[PDB]
Amino acid sequence: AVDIRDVKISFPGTQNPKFPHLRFMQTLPAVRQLTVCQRIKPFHRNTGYIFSCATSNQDNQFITSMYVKSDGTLNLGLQVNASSNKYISCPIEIELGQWYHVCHVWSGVDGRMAVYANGSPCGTMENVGKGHQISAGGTVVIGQEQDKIGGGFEEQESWSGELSDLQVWDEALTTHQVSTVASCNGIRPRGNVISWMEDSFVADDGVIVGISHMCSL
């Protein structure tokens, strides 16, 4: 009946010392490219970090984030190897509490960054982590921004809302491929690095496990 890809996690809200988050048990391998796709229902307009990857020597190896502009426009950001946050605007009005499919595509081979909203390209940006290779052993945390491996969280950088169908590949997916990932009734692909609910993660500080009805009612 209910597919495992539709399981969702709710990140209630953050307030020191409570930081709802997930931390994947297995560290990532070294990667030269990364595509992070997932379904999200944001609870606030201000900036929040969703996917955070940190190594012993670099707490900011790869970090995705978002925020909603005053006009309701979605802004997707990416930070690689402690670079400044690179933002790309998406031509879609965000209604807090509604579901959206978001994907960040990064390639250190050519330094190209691209983001997608609901399976459609929002635009690209050059010189983002160009020539950079994320060293092996990266620890992934969801919902909080790491300043130390698995910790050093800050409430102003947390992301509250609901998340599901997190899929990560160590390749830079094409525009066409991202649309096949977003499709609710599509093949619903599984990442080779992280496949939602197939790669163990620690749940802490009151996250809520439930079901997402973005695709199936």
Select 57 or 200, whichever has its Cβ closest to its own copies. 200
Subset of residues 39 to 58 that bind its own copies, contact rule: CB under 8 A: 41, 43
Say whether 154 counts as a known binding-site residue: yes
Select 82 or 208, whichever has its Cβ closest to its own copies. 208
Contact 130, 106 (CB under 8 A): no
Query: What gap in Å lies between CA 45 and CA 75, rounded to an integer?
Result: 10
Determine the residue type at 49: Y
Q: What is the CA radius of gyration of the chain?
A: 16
> Least CB distance from residue 179 to Ca ion, whole Å?
32
Select 67 or 116, whichever has its Cβ closest to Ca ion. 67
Question: Within 10 Å of residue 26's Cβ, how many Cβ atoms?
Answer: 12
Span between the terminal Cα atoms of the chain, in Å: 11
92 makes contact with its own copies (CB under 8 A): no
Say whether 198 counts as a known binding-site residue: no
Nearest to 83 by CA among 121, 126, 43: 126
Subset of residues 108 to 137 that bind its own copies, contact rule: CB under 8 A: 108-110, 112, 136-137
Contact 11, 49 (CB under 8 A): no
Residues 134, 138, 140: CA angle, nearest 5 degrees: 120
Select 6 or 157, whichever has its Cβ closest to Ca ion. 157
Q: Which stretch binds Ca ion (CB under 5 A): 7-15, 27-35, 113-121, 148-156?
A: 148-156
187 makes contact with its own copies (CB under 8 A): yes
Residue 124: its H or E element: strand 120-125
> Least CB distance from residue 6 to its own copies, whole Å?
8
Query: What gap in Å lies between CA 36 and CA 83, rounded to an integer?
Result: 18
Annotated binding site: 59-60, 145-147, 154, 157
Which residues of the chain form contacts with its own copies (CB under 8 A)? Answer: 1-4, 7, 22, 25-30, 32-33, 41, 43, 95-99, 107-110, 112, 136-137, 169, 171-174, 177, 180-181, 187, 189-190, 192, 197-198, 200-211, 213, 217
